[PDB]
Ligand binder design. Structure first.
Ligand code: ADP
Ligand code: ADP
Ligand code: ADP
Ligand code: ADP
Ligand code: MG
Ligand code: MG
Ligand code: MG
Ligand code: MG
Ligand code: MG
Lengths: 106, 526, 106, 76, 538, 525, 49
């Protein structure tokens, strides 16, 4: 359909409003997952790895790394939150929530 | 070689012991949890995807349960009891499922504590008897002559459905249909709304345009266009035999050797049709309705006498027309009598709705059948409205046959629970504990109402129990929309006694049946 | 060319255009003429053709040999057609027609 | 119509009727006499849970009995 | 971060095999490309110097032709925009009979220039309105370009001259012979009444003698043989029957009931006597030729042979009706002898062999009759089919001339004059529609360009010379294909003319197809089903 | 999931997932169908599996021809199907309003608000909107000009401008022809016959009938000037005896006698027809046409053609009533007593040949109560598109005639109704004011989509129109050529009142029902 | 109208073999049931008997 798909037959392309919709949907999904982390009244999440290790956490960055997500926009937001954690050590959940709400309002 | 030797056949499984009981009770609990949230005036609707491609968007518990397929046989028993409750009284299908689930849940506790299921079953039967006694004791009488009270009962029966917005019109339609269908012959009272209260759904229009007709309505048109499509006071003749020339039963063959025999035979066919039509005309009718075909020559001969004909109507529709217009279906018109001629219809009109022709035999005087013409947004909306109307008509019939009423909104449940708890104090054997357990398990209905309303369960339930511990507080329930305790003498939510009796009996016997079961065996064929 | 996500003709349509296809047509006509070339003259020789059923046909007739040959080339079928035409209108010279046409083309 | 053969035998015996496979006397004619009529004190098209059935109540010349069982479902 | 999911909404709701194309680049440009490719495929067959194409359909059937409609019919066209273009071409063929390649070329040029205009910035609606305005202007101009008229149709020489140009594009080498043949065939038909029927011209294809031996026959030719013994009649009195040549039977059920020996011994003899009496009654009217539409009984054939009656059996009812029209007889429903008005007369009926095939000829002698037959010779079935297509084109041209007698110069003269005047009109129109009008005018250049390309000369030089000459004021000057260098000449003297109706309908249909293709903005294609053709097509 | 424990191979979407799925499907449908609205909409191409081509911008046709397998899409498709069945217009607006209602409801639901409050606000706003629509409708005398305006408002949105201009006259004239005073209009009395041989602008109205079949006998006259029409439903072909007659003979002469005597029954009716024709018209000036619903065997055709009678066989059943109303005769099921008073009259009958198919025209009737529209186009898809357009126009004109009221178009009534809803919002008790605001915002979608399709910007055009309406109080819509506010009544852009009422009712009902769905189940396997 | 699509957002971004349980019924009750099962598994080996 698109030019790229014409040049590369097995190429996945999201163009025009499709790309914006995909990015906004991914951001909203991440925000929906991470809503419950905010505040001292938040809820513990239990994360089980492939080997079966059990991890209890409410940290936004820790939750993001252990989320079973393979989305591009999710990867971008995860990298931003990783930098946030690396430099300041706090605000990862707030980072994700603010990004998602910014995208939704836009 | 040497194929293995077995006592039972291959692929024949067998489970036994505590596991079977736990699995049965868990399956029943899950079945209850499926429709737990579809109870009360604040219930949410569910969308069901038919394997045939259809969509069933409904709030009725019985429809939801019958539209799903399960493999655990305890779930099958739950579906069966839901269908039984729907068929017997017409509503309460979610309440019985929830009650059975809760009773099995509280019986599991005693099963885990070295109590034989027979003791639990005996206690359940005693509790059921005392529940019946208490429900009969706290009931109130109703005079069916008061139309306002009947309308209020139907309203309270339909506030939990999607038709609550047009509740007033829905109640009027249901009451009119039930009163019209009511019939008596040879000293046998009869209210047959399954056969003589037909609901016809035509998409489009507005639901406020729906009404119940003083007659019947079918999707039919005149056989010939010149036939009248509007007759003021028609005389109706009903038939269920063809007006054509058909072969006989015996293997009959002609042998023609003369020239004029062929034309003679054809002319006698025409003359037979003419004689048949003349025998029909001798009664001087205005319209003729048949369940079988009408030949073109028969149409011509009928039209010569200015008679409208409808060709092929169903058996049930013909019976409904006979009830509505006072006709009598006959087969051989040479045996037609004046009594079989249907007079009483006040108008016959054939008008086009949308892009199809419909026949109206409305304006009847004292009709014993009716057609509820439903107009709405689409097929699913009309189907849900039809289900709600069926619930309303079933409630109306139950009240007409049994004029007793009991308070709603959980008030009956709490009152019966308190009475059972008070009676249990005199018990001294081991049976008292399951007795009290089922007594308090009866309180699941107000708890579910509070949960669906969105209020806090614990404090509202505690306050309701404290109120019911008083003397004259048997009518204290809960608002399903504001989450407050209100006397049901003021709110006006009441239910037929028959519905509550059937719900309690079905729940208790389902609990007993699933308690009696152990050692599931499966795998064998027929 | 380009993939052209939706294509004009049905897939598998084989097209040949220009001088090369005309040269190939001439070569096919030469091939057809070769199969009946040695049947001409008092010193001509017979050809034996076996069908799928196992029956053998022996003939010095050009039209018969060409008909028994199951020619599928669009340009080569013209020589068989003109051999049939010569057989129908005259009855003799069915080798000469093919030889003359192929020699003209060559 | 379509009454089961075993049901008809019990009704005929209980009500005093006589099963007639054909209308034919010993005189070669086709007749029906009142002597082959069973009697009952009532026959009702009763309704049982959205279905209907026939109750031949209190047949004379013989006493019969039938039992209708009600339960939660068909399994019960 | 290794996959791009489908966008929520319509992208996910689409079926597994469906395709959705939306927007300019995805839909309009793709459609224009497909139509341009189709026009390129059909371009090389345009004009007298067009080249034949061997097209093989899915049933391994050869089609060597330079007829655009036939080529498109035998091509498995799959792109739906190309499907609209093909439908427009077929509609042009149905309405007129010639000009299909013109429709293809004009639609392709219009869509190419529409793509150019969309690229430079114009909107689709502006291009569409400009195209419609230019089409209206062209239709207004076209009557003023008429050079001459048929002015008579019962003649032979000038009718042949008129029909030469129509069948000069196909069979360029030998068109005078075909023009004379078709002119004679059409002049035999077309009586004093102005109505002309195309189906009254019959084409018989007999293989063997080369197309130079083709002839025209004032009658009908059937590739059959006589049932009886008589094979030639000189004063035929044909009696036509739509019933089988046998004793009729009861339609319900026949059962010969025999109860005595005499009946058994007399039944067959009486039946034979009845057959003989019926045949002799038919013969006594003077009918020496009998034509039947059903089977022929043995006894009936014997008794017909006894009375010297020529039998012809025609299976097709269309052939029976055409023979009735040709001879002037009425197809009797029963086997009764015909009255004098129902008996047809043909001046000669005989059995003959042309080449190899045995034929039965119902031959007249007057230069008249309801139906005329053209016998086509040749050395190949495909060649005779192509000649038949040329004859069909000539007959359709004659029918169009009967409808409207006005003619316009050919060889691109009309196209060049139209382009010049449309450009002149568009140079005065203000607004953005001037670009679309000018592009519509330029699209006419594709006809002389295609003619020059097929002829083998430089198209640009020919077009520049045509503009120079038309600016000088010569409206009847077109491409001269009888030259090795770019040259032009007056086409009125050359007699190269095209029907006014053909140009009018071709322009209208091409413009309509182009604007209809341009109107499409979104495409939703279902998954290609594997069903064995739609039930409508059986 | 509880359901998955019983049926492992079951798909369930519960709680906010159900709302997300439903709203996503509705938004997808709305995004597809946005470009249809208004005369400036985009034409869509639909290629079937067999390769058929359909060009349309009709909402219902597009919905039926989209390759969609979603439940909520099926629900909205059924709603639009009912809309088309009853009113014949407003399906695209139906889908747009449903989608915008769901989106505006989600705008508040995603912020922790319960859908029940939104539904209550929706019902209150629907009641107020219906009251305002009753207040704003324009009662008028349905003369020819108003019907032409309504037909234009429909057809211009359906087809090309010039084609719409022709179809307006055709549809309005046909409706005025078949309309009896104080009597419901029967659209079955307008035959839609399509021919495929000329341009789309050649579609016209024939004050008579066009039959898709012609005479089966070559010798029958191809043109009759003054015709007596005999509409009959009598079989004129050989018919078997119902009782397995069979023949028995002992000689060839007996067989001949039986053959000649087996046709007497049909020949009697043929002779009756011929005698009536001779009695009615004793000269060659007048003509006789027999139209039969049942077949005619070749013998009867020959016998009739010997008398100069044109006979058509196997006519459509509706054609009996159509010819009875147009020609003025009467359909006959037998010839027992046929008199010159049972014959219709036609001022011209002739046959038209188009390729293999042949057509028969019956024109110049006295006062034809049944007429036909002859669709002519060079392509099949053109014919289908014109058929859809004329269906929409006929529905619009019939609706306009049915109730003497009519509503200003161009989205003016939507803007005024939204303004009235905003004004009435403070009177609504509780948090249902949010639902009322959502309903008003959803109602405002039509001018937004019209501005998009015309190429302008949503916010500027909408605020300009709303400010103009607030300042002047008139019913101002969207000028699709300039984008300025404009009075739709003055220019003649009219919408059907019944269409608007059905839109409001159906959209509100379906939105309320969908918003209350909390679980989607597929467990019937 | 024969399949229920995955809800937009997290339910679509989840991996293939991954599982996600949220809420009381899906998580807390299931965990309590598993612990109850383990307790039943080991209960019978308690005490001298
Ligand atoms: N005791 C409290 N009362 C009210 N608000 C609080 C309290 N403790 C924390 N907060 C607020 O809640 C937020 C907690 O966010 P947090 O879960 O830490 O996100 P992150 O982990 O990404 O920083 C802080 O922004 C803080 O302002
Ligand atoms: N206005 C109300 N306030 C409180 N409770 C109500 C109200 N209306 C109905 N109920 C309760 O809701 C129950 C009916 O729920 P419903 O959805 O009909 O389930 P079912 O079909 O199984 O009866 C009744 O038991 C009644 O007590
Ligand atoms: N002798 C000729 N010299 C130049 N041009 C000619 C001559 N004969 C025909 N033409 C041109 O060829 C065109 C016909 O092309 P043709 O192959 O018939 O396509 P179509 O069948 O679509 O008309 C006409 O426009 C005409 O102007
Ligand atoms: N000429 C016009 N100018 C402005 N608005 C118009 C004009 N014609 C139609 N409209 C508006 O555009 C809408 C057309 O919608 P339409 O495409 O017909 O959808 P549907 O077919 O579902 O009714 C109408 O509601 C009408 O108010
Ligand atoms: Mg923090
Ligand atoms: Mg209920
Ligand atoms: Mg030789
Ligand atoms: Mg040509
Ligand atoms: Mg519309």
């Amino acid at each position: 359909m698109a030019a790229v798909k014409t040049l590369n037959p097995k190429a996945e392309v999201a163009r025009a409003q499709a790309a914006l919709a995909v990015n906004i949907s991914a951001a909203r999904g991440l925000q929906d997952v991470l809503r419950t982390n905010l505040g001292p009244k938040g809820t513990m999440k239990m994360l089980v790895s492939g080997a079966g290790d059990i991890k209890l956490t409410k940290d936004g960055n820790v939750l993001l790394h252990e989320m079973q997500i393979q989305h591009p926009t999710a990867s971008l937001i995860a990298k931003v939150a990783t930098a946030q954690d690396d430099i300041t050590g706090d605000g990862t959940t707030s980072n994700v929530l603010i990004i998602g709400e910014l995208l939704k309002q836009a | 070689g040497h194929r293995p030797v077995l006592v039972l056949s291959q692929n024949t499984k067998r489970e036994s012991g505590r596991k079977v009981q736990s699995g049965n009770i868990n399956a029943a609990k899950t079945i209850a949890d499926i429709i737990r949230t579809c109870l009360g005036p604040k219930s949410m609707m569910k969308m069901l995807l038919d394997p045939m491609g259809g969509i069933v968007m409904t709030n009725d518990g019985n429809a939801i349960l019958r539209e799903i397929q399960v493999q655990h046989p305890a779930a099958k028993s739950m579906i069966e009891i839901s269908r039984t409750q729907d068929e017997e009284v017409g509503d309460g299908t979610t309440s019985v499922i929830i009650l059975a689930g809760e009773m099995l849940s509280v019986a599991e506790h005693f099963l885990e504590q070295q109590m034989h299921p027979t003791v639990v079953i005996s206690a359940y039967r005693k509790a059921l008897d005392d529940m019946i006694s208490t429900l009969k004791k706290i009931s109130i009488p109703v005079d069916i002559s008061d139309s306002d009270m009947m309308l209020n009962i139907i309203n309270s029966s339909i506030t939990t459905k999607a038709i609550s917005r047009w509740s007033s019109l829905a109640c009027n339609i249901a009451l009119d249909a039930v009163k019209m269908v009511q019939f008596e012959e040879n000293g046998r009272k009869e209210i047959d709304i399954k056969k003589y209260a037909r609901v016809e759904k035509i998409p489009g229009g507005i639901i406020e345009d729906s009404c119940v007709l003083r007659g019947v309505m079918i999707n039919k048109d005149v056989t010939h266009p010149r036939m009248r499509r509007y007759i003021k006071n028609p005389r109706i003749v009903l038939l269920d035999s063809s007006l054509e020339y058909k072969k006989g039963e015996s293997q009959t063959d002609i042998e023609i050797t003369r020239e004029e025999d062929f034309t003679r035979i054809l002319q006698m066919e025409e003359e037979y049709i003419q004689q048949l039509c003349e025998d029909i005309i001798q009664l001087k009718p205005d319209v003729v309705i048949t369940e079988k075909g009408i030949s073109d020559l028969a149409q011509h001969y009928l039209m010569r006498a200015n008679i409208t004909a409808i060709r092929r109507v169903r058996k049930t529709d013909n019976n409904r027309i006979a009830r509505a217009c006072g006709a009598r279906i006959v087969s051989r018109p040479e045996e037609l009598r004046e009594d079989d001629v249907g007079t009483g219809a006040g108008l016959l009109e054939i008008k086009k709705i949308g892009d199809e022709y419909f026949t109206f035999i409305t304006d009847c005087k004292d009709p014993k059948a009716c057609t509820i013409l439903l107009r709405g947004a689409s097929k699913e909306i009309l189907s849900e409205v039809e289900r709600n109307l069926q619930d309303a008509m079933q409630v109306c019939r139950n009240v007409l046959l049994d004029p007793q009423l009991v308070p709603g909104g959980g008030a009956s449940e709490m009152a019966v629970a308190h009475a059972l708890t008070e009676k249990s104090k005199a018990m001294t054997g081991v049976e008292q504990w399951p007795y009290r357990a089922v007594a308090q398990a009866l309180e699941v209905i107000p708890r579910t109402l509070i949960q669906n309303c969105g209020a806090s369960t614990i404090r509202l339930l505690t306050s309701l129990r404290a109120k019911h511990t008083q003397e004259n507080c048997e009518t204290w329930g809960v608002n399903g929309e504001t989450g407050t305790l209100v006397d049901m003498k003021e709110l006006g939510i009441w239910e037929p006694l028959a519905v509550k009796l059937q719900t309690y009996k079905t729940a208790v016997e389902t609990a007993v049946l699933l308690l009696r079961i152990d050692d599931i065996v499966s795998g064998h064929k027929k | 060319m380009m993939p052209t996500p939706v294509i004009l003709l049905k897939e598998g349509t084989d097209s040949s255009q220009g001088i090369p296809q005309l040269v190939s047509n001439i070569s096919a006509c030469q091939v057809i003429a070769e199969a009946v070339r040695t049947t001409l003259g008092p010193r001509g020789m017979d050809k034996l053709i076996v069908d799928g059923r196992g029956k053998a046909t022996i003939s010095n007739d050009g039209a018969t040999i060409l008909k028994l040959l199951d020619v599928v080339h669009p340009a080569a079928k013209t020589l068989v057609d003109i051999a049939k035409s010569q057989d129908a209108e005259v009855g003799d010279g069915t080798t000469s027609v093919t030889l003359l046409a192929a020699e003209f083309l060559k | 119509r379509r009454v089961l053969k075993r049901d008809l035998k019990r009704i005929a015996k209980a009500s005093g009727a006589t099963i007639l496979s054909t209308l034919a006397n010993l005189e070669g004619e086709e007749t029906f006499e009142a002597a082959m009529l069973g009697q009952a004190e009532e026959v009702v098209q009763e309704r049982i849970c959205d279905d209907e059935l026939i109750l031949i109540k209190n047949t004379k010349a013989r006493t019969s009995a039938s039992i209708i069982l009600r339960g939660a479902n068909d399994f019960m | 971060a290794l996959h791009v999911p489908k966008a929520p909404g319509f992208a996910q709701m689409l079926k597994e095999g469906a395709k959705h194309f939306s927007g300019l680049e995805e839909a309009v440009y793709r459609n224009i490309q497909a139509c341009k490719e189709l026009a390129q495929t059909t371009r090389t067959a345009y004009g007298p110097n067009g080249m034949n194409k061997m097209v093989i359909n899915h049933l391994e059937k050869l089609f060597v032709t330079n007829d655009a409609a036939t080529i498109l019919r035998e091509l498995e066209v799959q792109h739906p925009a190309a499907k609209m273009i093909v439908m427009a071409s077929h509609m042009q063929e149905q309405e007129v009979g010639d000009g299909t390649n013109f429709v293809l070329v004009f639609a392709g040029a219009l869509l190419e220039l529409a793509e150019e205009l969309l690229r430079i910035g114009l909107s689709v609606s502006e291009v569409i309105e400009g195209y419609e305005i230019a089409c209206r202007k062209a239709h207004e101009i076209l009557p003023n370009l008429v050079c001459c008229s048929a002015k008579n149709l019962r003649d032979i020489d000038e009718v042949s001259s008129l029909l030469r140009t129509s069948i000069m594009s196909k069979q360029y080498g030998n068109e005078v012979f075909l023009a004379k043949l078709i002119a004679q065939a059409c002049v035999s038909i077309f009586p004093d009444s102005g109505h002309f029927n195309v189906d009254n011209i019959r084409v018989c294809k007999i293989l063997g003698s080369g197309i130079s031996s083709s002839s025209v026959l004032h009658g009908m030719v059937f590739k059959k043989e006589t049932e009886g013994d008589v094979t030639s009649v000189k004063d035929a009195k044909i009696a036509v029957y739509s019933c089988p040549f046998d004793g009729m039977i009861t339609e319900t059920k026949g059962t010969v009931l025999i109860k005595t020996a005499e009946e058994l011994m007399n039944f067959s003899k009486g039946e034979e006597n009845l057959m003989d009496a019926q045949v002799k009654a038919i013969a006594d009217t003077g009918a020496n030729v009998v034509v039947t539409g059903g089977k022929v009984a043995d006894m009936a054939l014997h008794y017909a042979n006894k009375y010297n009656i020529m039998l012809v059996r025609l299976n097709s009812k269309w052939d029976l009706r055409r023979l009735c029209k040709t001879v002037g007889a009425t197809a009797l429903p029963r086997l009764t002898p015909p009255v004098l008005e129902e008996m047809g007369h043909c001046d000669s009926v005989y059995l003959s062999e042309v080449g190899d095939t045995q034929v039965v000829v119902f031959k007249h002698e007057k230069e008249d009759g309801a139906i005329s037959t053209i016998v086509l010779r040749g050395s190949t079935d495909n060649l005779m089919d192509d000649i038949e297509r040329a004859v069909d084109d000539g007959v359709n041209t004659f029918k169009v001339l009967t409808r409207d007698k006005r003619l316009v110069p050919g060889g691109g003269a009309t196209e060049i004059e139209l382009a010049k005047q449309i450009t002149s009109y568009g140079e005065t129109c203000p607004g953005l529609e001037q670009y679309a009008i000018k592009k519509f005018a330029e699209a006419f250049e594709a006809i002389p360009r295609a003619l020059a390309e097929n002829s083998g000369v430089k198209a640009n030089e020919v077009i520049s010379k045509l503009y120079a000459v038309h600016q000088e004021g010569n409206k009847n000057v077109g491409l001269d294909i009888e030259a090795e260098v770019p040259a032009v000449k007056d086409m009125l003297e050359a007699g190269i003319l095209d029907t006014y109706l053909g140009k009018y309908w071709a322009i209208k249909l091409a413009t309509n197809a182009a604007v209809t293709v341009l109107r499409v903005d979104q495409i939703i294609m279902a998954k290609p089903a594997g069903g064995p053709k739609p039930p409508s097509g059986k | 999931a509880a359901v998955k424990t019983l049926n492992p191979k079951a798909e369930v979407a519960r709680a906010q997932a159900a709302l997300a799925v439903n709203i996503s499907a509705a938004r997808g449908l709305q995004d597809v169908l946005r470009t249809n609205l208004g005369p400036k909409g985009t034409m869509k191409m639909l290629v079937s599996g067999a390769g058929d081509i359909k060009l349309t911008k009709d909402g219902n046709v597009l919905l039926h021809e989209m390759q969609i397998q979603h439940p909520t899409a099926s629900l909205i498709a059924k709603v639009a199907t009912a809309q088309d069945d009853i009113t014949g217009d407003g399906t695209t607006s139906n889908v747009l309003i449903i989608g915008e209602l769901l989106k505006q409801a989600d705008l508040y639901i995603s912020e922790g608000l319960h859908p029940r409050i939104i539904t209550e606000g929706f019902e209150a706003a629907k009641e107020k909107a219906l009251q305002f629509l009753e207040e704003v409708k324009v009662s008028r005398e349905m003369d020819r000009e108003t019907l032409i305006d309504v037909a234009r408002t429909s057809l211009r949105t359906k087809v090309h401008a010039e084609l719409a201009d022709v179809l307006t006259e055709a549809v309005v004239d046909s409706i005025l022809a078949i309309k009896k005073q104080d009597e419901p209009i029967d659209l079955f009395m307008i035959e839609i016959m399509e021919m495929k041989h000329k341009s789309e602008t050649d579609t016209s109205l024939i004050r008579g009938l066009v039959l898709d079949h012609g005479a089966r006998h070559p010798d029958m006259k191809k043109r009759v000037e003054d015709a007596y029409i005999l509409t009959c439903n009598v079989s004129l072909e050989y018919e078997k005896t119902e009782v397995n007659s069979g023949f028995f003979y002992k000689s060839a002469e007996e067989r001949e006698k039986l053959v000649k005597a087996e046709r007497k029954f049909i020949e009697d009716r043929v002779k009756k027809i011929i005698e009536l024709k001779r009695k009615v018209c004793g000269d060659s000036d007048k003509g006789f046409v027999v139209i039969n619903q049942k077949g005619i065997d070749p013998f009867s055709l020959d016998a009739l053609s010997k008398e100069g009678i044109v006979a058509l066989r196997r006519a459509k059943r509706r054609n009996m009533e159509r010819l009875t109303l147009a020609c003025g005769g009467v359909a006959l099921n037998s010839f027992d007593d046929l008199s010159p008073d049972c014959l219709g009259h036609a001022g011209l009958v002739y046959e038209y040949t188009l390729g293999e198919e042949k057509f028969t025209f019956i024109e110049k009737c006295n006062n034809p109560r049944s007429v036909t529209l002859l669709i002519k186009g060079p392509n099949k898809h053109t014919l289908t598109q014109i058929k859809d357009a004329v269906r929409d126009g006929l529905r619009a004109v019939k609706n306009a005639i049915d109730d003497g009221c009519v509503v200003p178009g161009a989205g003016a009534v939507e803007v005024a109704m939204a303004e009235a809803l905003i004004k009435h919002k403070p009177s609504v008790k509780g948090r249902a004011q949010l639902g009322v605001q959502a309903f008003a915002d959803a109602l405002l979608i039509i001018p937004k989509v019209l501005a998009q399709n015309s190429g302008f910007d949503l916010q500027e055009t909408l605020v300009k129109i709303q400010a103009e309406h607030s300042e002047s109080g008139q019913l101002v819509g969207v000028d699709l050529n300039t984008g300025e506010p404009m009075v739709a009544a003055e220019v003649g852009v009219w919408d059907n009142y019944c269409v608007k009422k059905q839109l409001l009712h159906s959209c509100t009902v379906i939105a309320t029902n969908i918003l209350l769905v909390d679980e989607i189940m597929r467990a019937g396997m």
